[PDB]
């Protein structure tokens, strides 16, 4: 974030935590009630889907 | 209940046709091979009808099981895709109102139709929050910092990118949920003054509830409310579509 | 410029977020959309552009 | 504290920079930044009413950056009513015992400061709270007739998962909370709680 | 059609002002020389 | 002025994560360099429309 | 489900996206993106802002 | 130091500037800056551990700007109670010996503080440490019967 | 299934804060004329 | 030419005359790809690649002219900015970066 002329270090984490996470927590999938993540899969117009 | 015909489920919360959001969700089912689902009861229509019926005793939900159409590009389901429209500029309400005017009347024709619903969303209660920048400037905090101090703590916001295992992803800063869950924490957020003094957000801020539609929609460039459902068992859809068109007149 | 930046300043879209948006607290049951500064719809408002 | 000056460095009388910083940490003061408009409602409510207090002034709590409340509470000394110009904010100075040397001059630690302790609060699950008309809490509570009737009210400030609502609802009101599909107004309904 | 509901029950409430109050030393009193001249020790 | 690394990360993969759902793609090849340069080649089935 | 969520999007989707016949993919999940969690009161504690 | 004034230049009694700055060399001062809650964390860390012995006047070491660590450690002098309002600064001073005058005060050289640490509880080689999913380390760990069961863990400060 | 295994125990660790800082004389005095006038030499 | 230039120092050099077609080959060499699925990293690939070549090169009766198309690493000039110093100095990074 900054420091001082003395250098005292005001950090990003020098206030709040930080961790990875999904871009949004908006979405969830379970599979058979088991936690899940999945893909919507669209056929491009025109292809043989087989 | 459906274990016998049901191999598997794939369910979704937060995502689903007719708009995203937490209030909405959807299910994907795998049933067992027909050869393992003998008779019609173990065929989807009744499977729907059954699940549809049962799901009637659900609470706070519009929950509709449905088979697909023949061409599945045009629709998520079988049944009929109909368009309410606002031609006259009668406005969202009459559209909303006169829509129910149909689903009202149509609900008295289960003989023809079943599971009739809008495909589109109702007006929700939005939380409006109002700056007086004057006070803000009076307090010698600039507004952007607010605007920063706002969207991100309450909305979160994107910044820039980094690399995870040889590929790019996104940076996020946001308030811990517990601090963004309520209008209370609003002014639990602060701003630093141009003189360095930290500034309660509530100081300059004011808020109220409003409404908004979580979604809006049009047809051919006009506001339109789609409606959905089916021709009740034994009913061809033309009978059903036709029935609608009659009810479409009132 | 004093006028300009001001115009830009106070006529714009300030996006917000949600109350109850993701991730929530467990025990949550009141999530919606937050509404905050927006563009002005009328001259007189613009006058109040400050 | 440290020495603003080493030995040999010249100094003047009552000069600008003090030389060393004495300090007394047994007690300590915590200035509580308060939203100007806020404390209004405070006495605004505390006479509003209701609200209440403990009859004395003043017991302040603390939860320090660890996410934990400070080892003990502290005493709110007063409230200086002067509206701080550039904070636009009242401040609360609550002297706290720090005979751990745990607190440090300045933090500024989270201070939860107890307040009016509303004697009677209408707390509706913010589920069942649906505003109407615009910004107007509409509770769906269904009377003995079990014909849902949404009775407009104004949810008070949001709290927990529920709305405190200063008005429009009464005790024993069965909140019609969920079932927002099977209940259009006036419809008969079988309660579950 | 049955419905989930919850009867009325408030009476109990405790509200408080929670926030990061700014602590400070009880008495600081930086030492400012009553006199001028060099600092001996 | 950049290395290939810098180039790759703030541009190349950037574009990569966008590249999808386009027809007759056989493959895609890419080069980042310390010249500050990029070339991303996408190979399409013959007779695919140029 | 986040562990799975992300491994997908990164290792799979785009190729899934680039796949022949795939005109669109839709994730169920989310890609990791750094979640910095801002404690307001600890900012003011440190006198800081987002 | 320099002559902050040159000859003939007027002076006023106890004036603002100083004509020049004398300075020592033997014991030099570095200003160790610490984060608030850390100093607080450690002081309640006093509750567990520390354990500083004993000789509770701690060692301190340096990586000099070259990245080379200063030849010999230095004495952590005192503990200030000071909170810089923009900082959280716990900043201390550990006076350091400077026989060769390599210290050259005012610089920006960092410094690590070794406090006596009793809490001998846990360590672990990296290899048994599974980073991702990160935020959670999990190790492949022998079950009671030799049935392997990994177990969730917290891997934070990697020690070598 | 045969693996290199290291059984874990309590290992005292003196690793601790490595934090920042600036350095100063001590010894960080000045020369301030306490008598006013022209510097002769 | 191919033979002669060989006598020079420092220069992967060869003269060539392009086939009837780039792709169309009656009998030449191949186009191969080592890939990083796990995000292992380049250096892991080179030591994976150089692992392939070193194993590749052991079958001249089958392999020939097996080569990486690209480029080995090189010493770089890497500044590590001490940030606190700078901002302890009050200098701004971007200007630093910028000025760079």
Task: Label each residue of G1-50 as H, E or C.
Answer: CHHHHHHHHHHHHHHHHHCCCEEEEEEECCCEEEEEEECHHHHHHHCCCC
Query: Among D106, D107, D108, D109, which would you mutate to test the H interface (most chain H Cβ atoms within 10 Å of its Cβ)?
Result: D106
DSSP helix/strand/coil, D55? coil
Yes or no, beta carbons of D121 and E20 under 8 Å apart: no
Dist CA F19 CA F43 (whole Å): 13
Which chain D residue has its CA at the smallest distance from C27's CA?
Answer: D161
Strands B222-231 and B82-85: antiparallel
Residues 6+ apart with CB under 8 A from H49: H116, H117, H118, H119
**List of chain B residues whose C-beta atoms are within 8 Å of the C-beta of residue C7:** none
Q: Phi and psi for B117 in degrees, rounded to 5?
A: -150, 160
Instruction: List, in order, residues 6 or more apart from B244 with CB less than 8 Å away.
Output: B80, B82, B102, B106, B113, B227
Question: Distance, in angstroms, between B176 CA and closest chain A CA?
Answer: 9
CA distance D184 to F41: 60
| Contacts with G49 from chain E: Cβ below 8 Å | none
| Residues D127 and D137 sit within 8 Å (Cβ to Cβ) | no
Measured in whole angstroms, the distance separating CA D112 from the mean position of its chain's CA atoms is 7
The helices-and-strands tally (H runs, E runs) of chain F is 2, 2
Give yes or no for a contact between H94 and I18, defined as CB atoms under 8 angstroms apart.
no
Contact between B11 and B25 (Cβ < 8 Å): yes
Distance CA C19, CA D161 (A): 11
Q: How many CB atoms lie within 10 A of CB G13?
A: 20
CB contact under 8 A, G35 and B162: no
Give the pair of three-digit tokens for residue D91: 């401040």
Instruction: Name the minimum distance, in Å, from the CA of D18 to any CA of chain I.
Output: 15
- The CATH code for residues B124-212 is 3.30.2090.10
Handedness of CA J92, J94, J96, J98 (dihedral sign): negative
- The tokens describing D158, both together, are 């949001």
**Helices (DSSP H) in chain C: which residue ranges?**
2-10, 43-48
Q: Where are the beta strands (DSSP E) in H39-114?
A: 59-61, 74-75, 92-97, 111-114
Contact B198, B47 (CB under 8 A): no
Q: Do chains A and J touch (3 or more CB pairs under 8 A)?
A: yes
Among candidates D9, D102, D106 on the partner chain, residue whose Cβ is nearest the Cβ of H85: D106
Q: How far is C-alpha A14 from the geometric centre of its chain's CA atoms?
A: 22
Distance of alpha carbon B203 from its chain centroid, rounded?
34
Contact H29, I41 (CB under 8 A): no
Best of H33, H36, H65, H90 to substitute, by most chain A Cβ atoms within 10 angstroms, is H33
CA atoms within 13 A on the CB side of I11: 10
Whether there are 3 or more C-beta pairs closer than 8 Å between C and I is no
Q: Which two tokens stand for residue J62?
A: 């089958």
Residue H32: its H or E element: strand H27-32
Contact call for residues D173 and D153 (beta carbons, < 8 A)? no
Decide: helix, strand or coil at residue H132.
Answer: coil
Distance from CA of B57 to the nearest CA of D (A): 9
Angle of helix B91-106 relative to helix B237-247, nearest 10 degrees, comes to 130
Any idea what the Cα angle at residue B242 is, between residues B241 and B247, rounded to 5°? 95
Beta bridge partners of E27: D24
Contact A7 J88 (CB under 8 A): yes
d(CA D117, CA D120): 9
Q: Report the 10 Å Cβ neighbour count for G31.
A: 24
Distance CA H92, CA H36 (A): 12
Tell which F residues from 11 to 40 touch A, by Cβ distance under 8 Å.
21, 23
Kindly report, as residue ranges, where domains of CATH 3.30.70.1430 are found in chain B: 1-76
A22 and G30 within 8 Å at the Cβ level: the answer is: yes
Kind of pairing, strands B6-13 and D155-159?
Answer: unpaired
Nearest Cα neighbor of H76 from H29, H123, H128 is H29
Distance CA D173, CA D149 (A): 12
Taking an 8 Å cut-off on Cβ atoms, the answer to whether D126 and C27 are in contact is no
Token duo for residue J9:
């120092």
Signed CA dihedral, B166, B170, B176, B178: sign only: negative
- Which residues of chain E are within 8 Å of residue I29 when distances are taken between CB atoms? 39
Considering only alpha carbons, which residue of chain G is nearest residue D108?
Answer: G45
Give the three-state DSSP class for A31. Answer: strand
Q: How far apart are CA J97 and CA B231, in angstroms?
A: 68
Q: Is the bond preceding residue H55 a cis peptide, omega within 30 degrees?
A: yes
Q: Could you give the residue range(s) of every CATH 3.30.2090.10 domain in chain B?
A: 124-212
CB contact under 8 A, H89 and A8: yes
Shortest Cα–Cα distance, J79 to chain H (Å): 12
**Cα end-to-end distance, chain J, whole Å:** 44
d(C-alpha D189, C-alpha F50), whole Å: 65
I33 Cβ contact partners less than 8 Å away, ≥ 6 residues apart = H11, H12, H13, H14, H15, H19
Q: How far is H106 from chain A, CA to nearest CA, in Å?
A: 9
Nearest CA in chain B to E2: B57
Phi and psi torsions of B171, nearest 5°: -100, 135
The Cα C25–Cα B179 span in angstroms is 9
- Chain H residue whose CA is closest to D11: H14
Decide if C29 contacts D180 (C-beta within 8 A): no
CB D65 within 8 A of CB H38: no
Burial grade of A27 (CB within 10 A; 0-12, 13-18, 19 or more)? buried
Q: How far apart are CA H82 and CA D21, in angstroms?
A: 10
For residues J7-31, b (16+ Cβ closer than 10 Å) or e, as one string? eeeeeeeeeeeeeeeeeeeeeeeee
Distance in angstroms (rounded) separating the CA atoms of residues B154 and C33: 10
User: Would you state the structure tokens that stand for residue B157, as one six-digit string?
Assistant: 């916001």
Calpha distance B14→D14 (Å, rounded): 67
Q: Which two tokens mark H73?
A: 């450690």
Which residues face G33 on adjacent strands? B170
Task: Kindly state whether G23 is in contact with chain F, defined as any CB-CB distance less than 8 angstroms.
Answer: yes
- The residue among B1, A3, H98 whose CA lies nearest residue I26 is H98
- Scored b (16 or more CB within 10 A) or e, B99-113 reads beebeeebeebeebb
Q: Determine how β-strand B222-231 pairs with β-strand B113-118.
A: antiparallel
Specify the DSSP class assigned to residue F12: I
Bridge partners of D75?
D59
Q: Resolution, in Å, please?
A: 5.9
| CB contact at 8 A, D11 and D5 | yes
CA distances (Å), origin B217, targets B18, B92, F42: 10, 10, 37
| Contacting subunits of A (3+ beta carbon pairs below 8 A) | B, C, F, G, H, I, J
Rounded to an integer, what distance in angstroms lies between the CA atom of residue H3 and that of residue D124? 76
Measure the CA–CA gap between B95 and B117, rounded to whole angstroms: 14
Which chains reach chain F with 3 or more Cβ–Cβ distances below 8 angstroms? A, B, G
C-alpha span between H71 and H68 (Å, rounded): 8
What Å distances lie between residue C21 and B14, B175, J10, J79, CA to CA? 11, 11, 63, 42
Contact between C36 and C16 (Cβ < 8 Å) = yes
- Strand-pairing partners, residue F29, are F41
SS (H, E, C) chain B: CCCCCEEEEEEEECCCCCCCCCCCEEEEEEECCHHHCCCCCCCHHHHHHHHHHHHHHCCCCCCCCCCCCCCCCCCCCCCCCEEEECCCCCHHHHHHHHHHHHHHHHCCCCCCEEEEEECCCCCECCEEEEECHHHHHHCCCCHHHHHHHHHHHHHCEEEEEEECCCCEEEEEEEECHHHHCCHHHHCCCEEECCCCCEEEHHHHEEEEECCECCCCCEECCEEEEEEEEEECCCCCHHHHHHHHHHHCCC
Please report all neighbours of D, defined by 3+ CB atom pairs within 8 A. B, C, E, G, H, I
**Chain B closest-CA separation from residue C4 CA (Å):** 16
Among D124, D160, D177, most C C-beta atoms within 10 A, so best to mutate, is: D160
- Asked if A16 reaches chain H (Cβ–Cβ under 8 Å), the answer is no
Give kind and range of the element (H or E) at residue J89: helix J83-89
Residue B31 bridge partners (DSSP): B6
Long-range CB contacts (within 8 A, 24+) of B35-41: B36/B5, B37/B4, B37/B5
Edge-to-edge, what's the strand order for the sheet holding C34-35? B205-209, B127-131, C34-35
Please give the Cα distance from D193 to D191 (Å, whole number).
7
Taken in order D13, D16, D19, D23, the sign of the CA dihedral is: positive
* Chains H and C lie in contact, requiring 3 or more CB pairs less than 8 Å apart: no
- Please return the burial class of G3, using the count of CB atoms within 10 Å of its CB with bins 0-12, 13-18 and 19+: middle
Query: CATH 3.30.70.1440: which residues of chain B?
Result: 77-123+221-250
- Cα separation of the two ends of chain E: 89
Domain B1-76: which CATH number of 3.30.1360.40, 3.40.50.300, 3.60.15.10, 3.30.70.1430: 3.30.70.1430
> How was this entry determined?
cryo-EM
What sign does the dihedral D153-D158-D159-D162 (CA atoms) show?
Answer: positive
CB contact under 8 A, H108 and A2: no
The answer to whether residue B55 neighbours chain E at the CB level (below 8 Å) is: no
Q: Which of A1, A2, A3, A11 to mutate to test the interface with J (most CBs of J within 10 A)?
A: A3
Distances (CA, A) of E1 to D65, G12, J60: 50, 47, 82
Q: Which residue has the tokens 């007719």?
A: B18
- The partner residue sitting opposite H87, judged by closest CB among A10, A19, A20, is A10
> Any idea which fold B77-123+221-250 has?
Alpha-Beta Plaits (3.30.70)
The residues, any chain, with a CB within 8 Å of residue B47's CB and separated by 6 or more, are B2, B5, B31, B41, B65
Q: Rounded CA gap, H65 and H110, in Å?
A: 8
Q: What count of other Cβ atoms lies within 10 Å of the Cβ of residue H132?
A: 16
Q: Could you give the strand order of the β-sheet that contains D190-192, starting from the edge strand earlier in sequence?
A: D175-176, E2-6, D190-192
> Do residues D60 and D76 lie in contact, with contact meaning Cβ atoms separated by under 8 Å?
yes
The secondary structure element, H or E, covering residue H29 is strand H27-32
User: For residue B248, which of B64, B76, B49, B80 has the smallest C-alpha distance?
Assistant: B80
Bridging pattern class, strands B168-175 and B157-163 = antiparallel
Q: Does G49 touch chain E (CB under 8 A)?
A: no
Size of interface A-G (CB pairs under 8 A): 115
Taking the CA atoms of residue I4, residue I8, residue I12 and residue I17 in that order, the dihedral angle to the nearest 10 degrees is 80
Q: List the beta bridge partners of residue B191.
A: B199
Q: Which residues in I lie closer than 8 A to residue H104 (C-beta atoms)?
A: 23
């Amino acid at each position: 974030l900054k420091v001082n002329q003395d250098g005292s270090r005001v950090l990003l984490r020098d206030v709040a935590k930080i961790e990875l996470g999904g871009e949004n927590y908006d979405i969830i999938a379970e599979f058979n009630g088991q936690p899940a993540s999945g893909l919507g899969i669209k056929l491009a117009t025109g292809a043989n889907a087989l | 209940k459906e274990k016998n015909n049901v191999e598997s489920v794939f369910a979704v919360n937060g995502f689903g046709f007719a708009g995203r959001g937490q209030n909405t969700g959807i299910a994907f089912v795998s049933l067992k091979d027909w050869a393992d689902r003998p008779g019609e009861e173990n065929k989807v229509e009744a499977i729907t009808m059954r699940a549809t019926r049962a799901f009637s005793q659900i609470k706070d939900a519009m929950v509709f099981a449905f088979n697909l159409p023949a061409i599945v590009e045009l629709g998520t389901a079988t049944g009929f895709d109909f368009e309410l429209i606002d031609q006259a500029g009668l406005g969202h309400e009459k559209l909303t109102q006169a829509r129910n005017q149909l689903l009202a009347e149509a609900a008295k024709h289960p003989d023809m139709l079943t599971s009739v619903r809008p495909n589109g969303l109702e007006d929700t209660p939005q939380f409006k929050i109002d700056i007086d920048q004057e006070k803000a400037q009076a307090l010698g905090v600039s507004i952007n910092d607010i605007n920063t101090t706002l969207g991100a703590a309450w909305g979160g916001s994107y910044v820039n990118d980094f690399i995870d295992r040889g590929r790019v992803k996104k940076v996020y800063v946001m308030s811990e949920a517990k601090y963004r869950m309520l209008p209370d924490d609003i002014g639990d957020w602060y701003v630093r003054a141009a003189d360095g003094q930290m500034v309660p957000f509530s100081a300059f801020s004011s808020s109220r509830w409003e409404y908004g539609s979580p979604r809006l929609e049009r047809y051919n460039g006009l506001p339109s409310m789609e409606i959905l459902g089916q021709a009740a068992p034994g009913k061809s859809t033309g009978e059903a579509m036709e029935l609608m068109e009659q009810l479409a007149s009132k | 410029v004093d006028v300009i930046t001001a115009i830009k300043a106070q006529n714009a879209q300030v996006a917000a977020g949600q109350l109850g948006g993701t991730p929530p607290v467990k025990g949550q049951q009141l999530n919606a959309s937050i509404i905050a500064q927006t563009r002005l719809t009328s001259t007189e408002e613009f006058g109040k552009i400050l | 504290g440290k020495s603003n000056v080493t030995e040999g460095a010249l100094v003047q009388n009552g000069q600008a920079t003090a030389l060393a910083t004495v300090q007394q940490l047994d007690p300590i003061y915590v200035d509580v930044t308060q939203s100007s408009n806020d404390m209004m409602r405070l006495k605004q409510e505390l006479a509003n009413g209701t609200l209440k207090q403990e009859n004395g002034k003043a017991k302040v709590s603390l939860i320090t950056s660890d996410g934990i409340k400070f080892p003990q509470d502290g005493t709110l000394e007063f409230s200086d009513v002067t509206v701080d110009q550039t904070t636009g904010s009242i401040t609360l100075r609550a002297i706290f015992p720090n005979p751990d040397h745990t607190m440090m001059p300045g933090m500024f630690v989270r201070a939860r400061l107890e307040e009016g302790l509303n004697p009677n609060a209408i707390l509706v699950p913010q589920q069942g709270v649906t505003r109407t008309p615009r910004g107007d809490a509409t509770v769906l509570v269904v009377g003995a007739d079990d014909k849902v009737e949404t009775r407009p009210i104004v949810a008070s400030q949001a709290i927990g998962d529920k709305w405190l609502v200063t008005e429009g609802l009464k005790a024993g009101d069965r909140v019609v909370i969920s079932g927002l599909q099977k209940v259009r107004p006036g419809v008969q309904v079988k309660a579950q709680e | 059609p049955a419905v989930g509901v919850v009867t009325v029950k408030t009476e109990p409430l405790q509200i408080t002002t929670e926030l990061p109050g700014r602590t400070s030393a009880y008495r600081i009193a930086e030492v400012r020389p009553q006199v001028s001249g060099i600092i001996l020790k | 002025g950049a290395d290939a690394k810098t180039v790759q990360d703030t541009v190349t993969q950037v574009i990569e994560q966008n590249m999808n759902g386009i027809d007759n793609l056989m493959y895609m090849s890419s080069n980042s360099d310390s010249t500050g340069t990029v070339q991303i080649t996408l190979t399409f089935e013959s007779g695919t429309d140029a | 489900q986040e562990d799975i969520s992300d491994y997908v999007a990164a290792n799979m989707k785009d190729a899934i996206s680039r796949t022949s016949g795939v005109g669109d993919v839709q994730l169920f999940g989310s890609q990791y993106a750094m979640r910095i969690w801002m404690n307001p009161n600890e900012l003011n504690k440190f006198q800081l802002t987002p």
